[PDB]
A paper describes a structure:
The bacterial enhancer binding (bEBP) subgroup of [name]+ proteins couple ATPase hydrolysis to initiation of transcription by σ54-RNA polymerase (σ54-RNAP). [name] (di-methyl phenol regulator) from [name] KCTC 1452 (also known as CapR) is a single-component bEBP that serves as a sensor of phenolic compounds. As is typical of bEBPs, [name] consists of three domains: (1) a sensory domain consisting of a vinyl-4-reductase (V4R) scaffold that functions in binding of an aromatic effector molecule, (2) a conserved central [name]+ ATPase domain bearing the bEBP-specific GAFTGA motif that is involved in coupling ATP hydrolysis to the restructuring of σ54-RNAP, and (3) a DNA binding domain that interacts with the palindromic upstream activating sites (UASs) situated ~100–200 bp upstream from the σ54 promoter.
This truncated protein, [name]ΔD, has an N-terminal 6 × His tag that replaces the first 15 residues, lacks the DNA binding domain, and carries serine substitutions of two cysteine residues (C119S/C137S) that were anticipated to be located at the protein surface. The two dimers—P1/P2 and P3/P4—form the tetramer, which has an antiparallel head-to-tail assembly that places the four ATPase domains at the central core of the complex. The phenol is located in an enclosed cavity (24–36 Å3 in volume) formed by an antiparallel hairpin motif. A strictly conserved Trp128 residue is located between the phenol-binding site and the zinc-binding site, while the zinc is coordinated by residues Cys151, Glu172, Cys177 and Cys185. Interestingly, the electron density of the phenol group is strong in the P1 protomer, whereas it is weak in the P2 protomer.
Author numbering:
A (entry chain D), C (entry chain A): 13 to 481
B (entry chain C): 14 to 481
D (entry chain B): 17 to 481
Write the structure that this text describes.
């Protein structure tokens, strides 16, 4: 009580501004706040809106504590502390009736009990009422906690032992230091920010990525740039797409030649046509020939039913052949006939079948001396060497490594949350200085190990990948 | 200002501030800045924008009623200008109306105004980056509200430029909503959808989508204690206590494999491996090599030795669907495993004992299959010790609703979040059906009924088994 | 042992022929037969070799029974039946010891117990150091069953009760007519000659079809024959796909607009670039804008970490927008800016970045009258209506119904069932007389239900689909 | 010679020197080849009969060398074709012969009259536009190679089964031929049964992996630590006591709780696991106990909690320390009185839920900081169960890794047949901060980095060393 601050609330109406000391002020309507709190509780629940108003009262109380300290710096301990309730009476929030006070800034002692008459929160509560079985003066309590804590330096927690919105006779509150309370953990959880919008964004992102994981075979790599070698590889595949040339993918294991062939097929004039990939190592050669070219029924090797070969399955399209060196010699002769005249014969069949099939082979072994050993035909090598396309390893793309890895982090982050919000410059330096035999598979694997292995820290360990053992 | 400066009566001793007949309060601008900051940080920008817009709109309605009750007639322009004069009086903004055209009787309205020293831009200063959209929200709401209450028509302003976006001046234009082209963007702010319900809904969707991951037991037959389901349940639970092999006689598509899984879970060996085997797989020489393995050597064409499926069920349980489709050597080896607890891999001389419970199943009548020599009598009598007949849905008339209800909840979450309706005519049509396919056909028709349902709250009667 | 047996094996050394009665014969080494059986068992199954040798012995026994009948023509029942095993002894295969016999060709009664001394099959078992777990005298048993059956006129079946190759003391066999046996199926299974090469081709085809799921599906039911309505839609789709013009797909639910947009992207110049489809049925408020255009972190919005929008995911590529009418007005404005100026900015983002994204919107509701009442902006409507493409309901393409279902049937023939491709024309005539309110999705669903309701019947039953209530 | 094929019919045997012989019918061989081609094709049966004739020819070459040790250089080679004529296979007419054992030179051309293979071909006919005398050709090649010591290859330049007038064959050393790769490919064993077993195994594993996994981490024995942990979980399984799993990150506590649930008396009842760290606490409270509709907390529709979803069953709670204090009080009420209330609801609901909490942080001092309730800690610490790290189970490590390698070998269908004991020593000598999880990860990376039949390198895992 005892205001004596109306002389400092000077204001100039002509400019549309209100002042108090050096601080700007605003005059808001109470009915608007009533509808505001009504819709707030309707769209946020009660516990969440209570915590939000509590945090806002705490922030307003810290600001008013700074203001009161700027107003009368050398008043007195009690005279400075009373400015809080005096600010409540001045701003029209509540009328304060402190029935008991005990304060000593040096010893840390604190205790108070006060009555809040004509609280604006109980007045708006008459507009939005229902069960109202818990105290409603939330911003008042948060402002009280903030002002008392800023004045004492200790954590002070108030509790409205009685409130008019609960059917009680008078709003009465008690304030003691937090150490002298029984259960403060619930109150401290009331003070947490709990940003629901970020939780909603994370849930929507995880839900979209989890529902899109079906048919998730389009985004891969080979589409980032930033190194001259990749630019050469992409413009070279652009040149190969427009032409009818059979393409040979020279590279190393784990560089992703199959997705490269898929991109070359999509960039070609026959992108809508089927694309069939065949890993020659997966199929034993005795089955390799019959799978690549099919087989017709009959007494000659004839099974019960004719089966179309993979080349006819890719008619008007493209055939990819990984590890083409591992072909049976008769299959190599059939491939040479298909490549030079566009004709094939099913196994056990004498009649010919026309085809129009683009060919993209790939291999890691040095085919030039492989022909010298008799392991591969010379003519088929001559027909396949028309358009070599070298795909560099990451060791040839050292400066390109970081963009991939952070992208990989996102690819794992939504699967497991934004764990490891760091890069560990030592780990990045170790990644720049490594041969990487599995240039993209080993990278994805070690990044998976780094994501799973860094649970009790927000920064990736340098030992999580390339452990010293 | 004649003479509104005297309208702000306040008594400090009473702890109240008054304006006309309306109680009011005076807050700091920095506190409102932190208020808007935490508000936008907790909800979306549009949610907070709608909140502040509705707050300004309610304040404008109340202030229009107050100005109407203060000076009764006077003049039209003075009564309309009392709104912006109230804005200047409360410390919100300074108003500079550069153009006005008002006629309350005819309904004509147009106005262009400048908002100088808006407090909302002072709150925008706490956010170092410029906002991409105008920030004077409660100002716009109070403007539209006061203008609409003063005219009797709905009047809508729009901040064509704002200083919080980097503009030179806060400039607003106000004309009646019917004279606008696109008004829906303003009306979207008035819709108040509870964000917490969307959080619970998204968490429920993600939890339901990740709960469909790798669980083994969730299929059907809940606590619907129908006499037939209860008899079959007590039969399986009494069967689980022993090691006796159990034969599941029933109909195709009833899901005998999960029944065997439940029998294994109710058994004493639930922690031990449970392996199901469909005999529809080709049974030439591969059925024997897969069921009992094969050892490497020159005595058989095996480069690598391969463990059989029965050894994978060691100390556990093996399910055998369509047991009639076994080769006679496989029937003999199964009889040896069932009567002596021993087996030997193909091409292997040494023998190893095993402890494997057996759950066979078949749709064909096994008695007449043993007749004509298609199946050995020994294995038949060893497997028929504890038959468990699974009734068709035709005799399960009372279990049909509970099932479909669970299936509804099971499939409404499947990429659709749709209706829970049943349409009693469709339900009576469903209870009166032979169901040649028991559970598979019912789940298929339930999905087909889900196909032709818009998020209208009712499954169509004609969506199931249409006239043609 | 008989006057006619010795010296009956006429043979000419210089002429290169060996004869026995009227039958040509061959003399092979035992070690060669041992390596023969070794290669046979090492390449095929134990049962495959068992059935081959048993059938070979059966044919030899049938021919030798006819030979013994024509050699001594007068009956002497026991003498001819014992001449059978005596013929076994003459060829050097086995020594026979009939310990019990009971024969009456007229009454059909038969029983015999015999011992096989020095069987060559056990000597071949000696080359396989591991003892067989089952009796090894296969061709002997087949010759026995064949000779006894031809001599009696009834089917006679022997079984080796004990064998020296399985570790037994003596080779002991019992022969009685098949009707007098208890379990005969295990022996009868050896007469079935199922080609192993067909099983190899079938297993390779199944494994390849299951391993081809790693590749993205080549497409869906978009490719059908040149039906005039489908052909008009096809040529319109091709001329629209060549350009960057945004395409609006007006149609009905279940018509499959997404596969249409995917085919448009594959036929476009940006097929290698990402294609992202977005259904607006997902919850809209503030989430539709943040997902379509992203959001940047900062104090201006409740974003802890920035999230890329789906339009940025479609950079240089194509985005599909199903139910575009269900866009928030802010989303419609941002989409209009992206479509008219090629630029967008993330929510809460200060800097603007341009994008190059083709747009394919689609809707079942009529956009006309939707712009009325304000549900959709006129600017975006006129910008999207430049190239409408109406997709007819299946009622106008009933001539396409068989082509679809046939492709669907074989597509479902691989679905864990290896079931049927039949149609039953009455069911097709019942299908043509139906509105199909759900066009293609409902037809695929009823086809799956019919596959569930039909086992070996090849034509799906006419009554299997849509039975009466 | 015919004088050496003496035999005694009384014992049922035919002899030639010290080698036993047998007399087989030709009609049986005709049906044999018919069924062989019907179930194997033509090229496969051709290679089979070729190598079988090769084996018979090598055996007959050893026999002929045993018959006349001092046979002349010409007569010893001629013993082959006369053995062909003696056994009834073919009549031989050598039109040219040239042999020199020392220099390795060889050449011959001969006629095969009345071949039995063309005779059976007359019964089983069709295309047969390629030479049919397969076993004869293999026997000739084997005998000439065994006699010379060099690779000698014959080829039937003409055959009566191809419509030709006479069967004519030529034998030359393999180096002097143009295309020998086809014949050498004909000589390969080609075990089709092994390919069938491999395809069936890969197909069965590929069809069962789509049916979802159950668990794997448990069941690896032969170490004291695992045996103590398993007997502890066995003793804990029969009771209803709430269990606290104290361990380390990545030790696989969830599968341990699932095995304890299956070993318990409520194995048929539902089992629900919840990782508290994955769910933000603001959602943790509403998710563990549900929420009721009303003006309170929002909620357009009531939502069941995970505890009611696990009624009559068991709930696992990883990282129980990260619970909101009101959720901790509700969990203590559920634990000591078996009752719960949905958020925003006043009425109580009975439940019967077994509880297994787990944590990696030191729970004892976490209560001292005010981060966790004391009463709930006393109620959860009733039965602590420590799960050791792999460093305490080093002797068990190789068994795990071999099972791991097998589960990954089948992951790609055909992979390295080695472990490299040096790499095993490196695995035993590592802290493994991520037990079983880091082991699976390093093994997958090492397997992807190796592709031959060679042992996996120690640098494939723990590189840069
Ligand atoms: Zn109160
Ligand atoms: Zn402004
Ligand atoms: Zn025997
Ligand atoms: Zn010939």
């Amino acid at each position: 009580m005892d205001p004596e601050f109306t002389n400092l609330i000077h204001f100039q109406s002509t400019e549309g501004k209100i002042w108090l000391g050096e601080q700007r002020m605003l005059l808001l309507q109470v009915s608007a706040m009533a509808s505001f709190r009504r819709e707030m509780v309707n769209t946020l629940g009660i516990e969440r809106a209570k915590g939000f108003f509590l945090r806002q009262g705490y922030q307003s109380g810290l600001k008013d504590a700074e203001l009161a300290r700027k107003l009368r710096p050398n008043a007195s301990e009690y005279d400075m502390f009373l400015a809080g309730p005096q600010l409540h009476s001045l701003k029209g929030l509540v009328k304060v009736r402190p029935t008991e006070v005990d304060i000593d800034k040096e010893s840390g002692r604190f205790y108070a009990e006060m009555e809040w008459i004509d609280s604006f929160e109980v007045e708006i509560s008459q507009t939005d009422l229902g069960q109202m079985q818990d105290p409603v003066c939330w911003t008042l309590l948060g402002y009280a906690c903030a002002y008392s804590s800023a004045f004492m330096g200790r954590e002070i927690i108030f509790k409205e032992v009685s409130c008019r919105g609960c059917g009680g006779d008078k709003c009465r509150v008690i304030g003691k230091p937090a150490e002298e309370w029984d259960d403060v953990a619930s109150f401290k959880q009331y003070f947490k920010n709990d940003p629901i919008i970020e939780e909603l964004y994370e849930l929507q992102s995880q839900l979209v990525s989890l529902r899109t994981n079906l048919d998730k075979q389009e985004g891969q790599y080979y589409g980032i740039g930033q190194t001259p070698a990749y630019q050469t590889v992409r413009n070279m595949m652009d040149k190969a797409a427009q032409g009818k040339v059979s393409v040979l993918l020279l590279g190393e294991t784990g560089v992703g030649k199959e997705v490269i062939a898929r991109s070359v097929h999509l960039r070609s004039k026959r992108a809508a046509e089927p694309f069939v990939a065949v890993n020659c190592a997966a199929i034993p050669p005795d089955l390799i020939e019959s799978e690549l070219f099919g087989v017709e029924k009959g007494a000659f090797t004839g099974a019960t039913q004719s089966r179309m070969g993979r080349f006819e399955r890719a008619d008007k399209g493209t055939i990819f052949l990984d590890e083409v060196i591992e072909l049976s010699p008769r299959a190599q002769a059939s491939l040479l006939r298909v490549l030079q005249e566009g004709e094939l014969e099913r196994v056990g069949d004498n009649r010919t079948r026309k085809i129009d099939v683009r060919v993209i082979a790939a291999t890691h072994e040095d085919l030039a001396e492989a022909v010298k050993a008799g392991r591969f035909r010379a003519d088929l090598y001559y027909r396949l060497n028309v358009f070599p396309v070298a795909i560099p390893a990451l060791r040839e793309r050292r400066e390109d490594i970081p963009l991939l890895v952070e992208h990989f982090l996102q690819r794992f982050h939504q699967e497991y949350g934004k764990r490891t919000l760091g890069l560990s410059d030592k780990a990045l330096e170790a990644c720049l200085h490594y041969s990487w035999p599995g240039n993209i598979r080993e990278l994805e694997n070690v990044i998976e190990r780094g994501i799973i292995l860094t649970d009790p820290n927000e920064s990736i360990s340098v030992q999580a990948l390339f452990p010293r053992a």
